[PDB]
């Protein structure tokens, strides 16, 4: 039994927008849960965000998490933008709503409950679990069954 919840995520997309999917591996309690879904029209960034949200939302109590992803958008958001956006009421300098505010606000809520250690992997050097995420994410996008509701060409 791991003394820390381990989370691995990836997302993929064939176009901008296009069909896309996500893969998330969660090691919680004594099992290994795998999540993966495809969406009809979405973006890469949205899928990488969706990876992390679905895994964290599966966490029913406050936990000590370690999340590993090679995603630069999650990283960039988490390390340099997020802190700034709350202070600005989730707006851009031009007073418009941030892009993917629906996903960022949603992930924000999910982290609020936990102790999190972020591990930024290099695409070419993740653990066997990040690669499986890549493969799940890819397969999902090849067979999309869901609609990405917050997507806009727009805002």
Curated annotation (Swiss-Prot):
The EC designation for this entry is 3.1.26.4
Alphabetized GO MF terms? endonuclease activity; magnesium ion binding; nucleic acid binding; RNA-DNA hybrid ribonuclease activity
Q: Main site of residence? A: cytoplasm
Q: Which reaction(s) are listed as its catalytic activity?
A: Endonucleolytic cleavage to 5'-phosphomonoester
Coiled-coil regions, chain positions: none
Keyword flag Transmembrane: no
| Documented effect of changing residue 130 to A | Reduces activity
Q: Which UniProt keywords apply?
A: Cytoplasm, Endonuclease, Hydrolase, Magnesium, Metal-binding, Nuclease
Q: Name one Pfam family in it.
A: RNase_H
Its top-level enzyme class, in one word, is hydrolase
Q: Does the keyword ATP-binding apply?
A: no
The record's function comment reads: Endonuclease that specifically degrades the RNA of RNA-DNA hybrids. RNase H participates in DNA replication; it helps to specify the origin of genomic replication by suppressing initiation at origins other than the oriC locus; along with the 5'-3' exonuclease of pol1, it removes RNA primers from the Okazaki fragments of lagging strand synthesis; and it defines the origin of replication for ColE1-type plasmids by specific cleavage of an RNA preprimer. Involved in production of retron derived msDNA (a branched RNA linked by a 2',5'-phosphodiester bond to a single-stranded DNA).
Q: How does it assemble?
A: Monomer.
The protein in question is named Ribonuclease HI
Give me the gene this protein comes from: rnhA
